[PDB]
């Protein structure tokens, strides 16, 4: 829990699953090599990257077709806070810090 973030999946096949963010770039998408592997037809190969810069979590849309809705709001880059709802296609994810 120290200096790390949790991404508990609210809606999706892997419901309840947790992804731990503590690296400078924690990738997410339909590509097998992505850290946060999200498999769905809505989700693009490279959907978003969870960048941590000096204890500051922030998700950035790296060029996905369905984009990324933080708190049901389409964003290109948004600084994340405890309680945000980052959406990647059909995958609803909650933010914990």
């Amino acid at each position: 829990p120290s200096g790390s973030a949790l991404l508990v999946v609210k809606r999706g096949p892997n419901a309840g699953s947790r992804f731990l963010l503590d690296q400078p770039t924690t990738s997410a998408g339909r590509h097998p090599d992505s850290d946060i592997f999200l498999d769905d037809v809505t989700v693009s190969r490279r959907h978003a990257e969870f960048r941590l810069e000096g204890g500051e979590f922030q998700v950035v849309d790296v060029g996905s077709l369905n984009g990324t809705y933080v708190n049901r709001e389409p964003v290109d880059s948004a600084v994340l806070a405890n309680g945000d709802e980052v959406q990647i296609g059909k995958f609803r994810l909650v933010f914990l810090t």
Partner: protein, 109 residues
């Protein structure tokens, strides 16, 4: 359907791209029909150009969609290539019968 609880029919007019076999060229029977389909564009790629032409999407959004096309095409080709390498009491008492025999005379008021 939710408002009137009645069947609804949607006639989707499209085209059949190929015959009913790998070596089937139905241009023997319908040459005019298949001459048109020869020069047709895919209902996904044509819609992609329409969104750019109408100003609905940009060339960055055209890259987001084109990367998603390859990202989903590679997705199934590689998943399949990897998964290929890994290969009693049948009777009642008379009181039950007497309940059914009385139900025929248990007429409403």
């Amino acid at each position: 359907r939710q408002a009137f609880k009645k069947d609804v029919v949607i006639d989707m007019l499209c085209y059949r791209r190929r015959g009913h076999n790998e070596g089937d060229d139905p241009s023997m029977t319908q040459p005019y029909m298949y001459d048109v389909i020869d020069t047709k564009r895919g209902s996904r790629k044509a819609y992609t150009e329409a969104l750019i032409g109408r100003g609905d999407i940009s060339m960055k959004e055209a890259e987001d969609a084109l990367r998603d096309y390859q990202g989903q095409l590679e997705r199934v080709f590689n998943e399949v290539r990897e998964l290929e390498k890994h290969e009693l009491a049948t009777a009642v008492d008379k009181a039950m019968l007497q309940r059914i025999g009385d139900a025929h005379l248990a007429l409403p008021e």
